[PDB]
Amino acid sequence: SIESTSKSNFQKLSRGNIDVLKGRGSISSTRQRAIYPYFEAANADEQQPLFFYIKKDRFDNHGYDQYFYDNTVGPNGIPTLNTYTGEIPSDSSSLGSTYWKKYNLTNETSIIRVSNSARGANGIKIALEEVQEGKPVIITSGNLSGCTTIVARKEGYIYKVHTGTTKSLAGFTSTTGVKKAVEVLELLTKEPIPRVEGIMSNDFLVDYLSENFEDSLITYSSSEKKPDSQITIIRDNVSVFPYFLDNIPEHGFGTSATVLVRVDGNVVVRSLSESYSLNADASEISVLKVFSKKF
Distance CA 58, CA 205 (A): 29
Number of C-beta neighbours around residue 150 at 10 A: 28
| Distance (Å, whole) CA 81 – CA 69 | 7
Q: Write down the H helix ranges in 201-270.
A: 202-212
Task: Round to whole Å and give the CA distance between 181 and 185.
Answer: 6
Residue of 267, 257, 22 whose CA lies nearest to 144: 257
Distance between CA 100 and CA 96 in Å, rounded? 10
Residues 6+ apart with CB under 8 A from 229: 173, 174, 201, 202, 220, 221, 222, 223
User: Do residues 261 and 15 touch, judged by C-beta distance below 8 A?
Assistant: yes
**Cis bond upstream, residue 49 (ω within 30):** yes
Task: Report how this structure was experimentally obtained.
Answer: X-ray
**Cβ within 8 Å of residue 147, ≥6 positions away:** 116, 141, 162, 163, 164, 165, 173, 177, 221
- Specify the length of the chain in residues: 295
Domain of residue 136, residue span: 1-295
Ramachandran angles phi, psi of 10, nearest 5°: -65, -45
DSSP string of 62-88, one letter each residue: S---GGGEETTSTTT-EESEEEEETTS
Number of domains in the chain: 1
Cα–Cα dist 273/101, whole Å:
19
Q: Give residue 142's Cα distance to chain centre.
A: 7
C-alpha–C-alpha distance, residues 69 and 199, integer Å: 29
3-state secondary structure of 142: coil
CATH number, position 84:
3.60.100.10
Residue type, 90: S
Name every residue whose Cβ is closer than 8 Å to that of residue 17 and which is 6 or more positions away in sequence.
none
What are the backbone dihedrals phi and psi of residue 269, each rounded to the nearest 5 degrees, phi first?
-130, 125
What's the distance, CA 31 to chain centroid?
A: 16
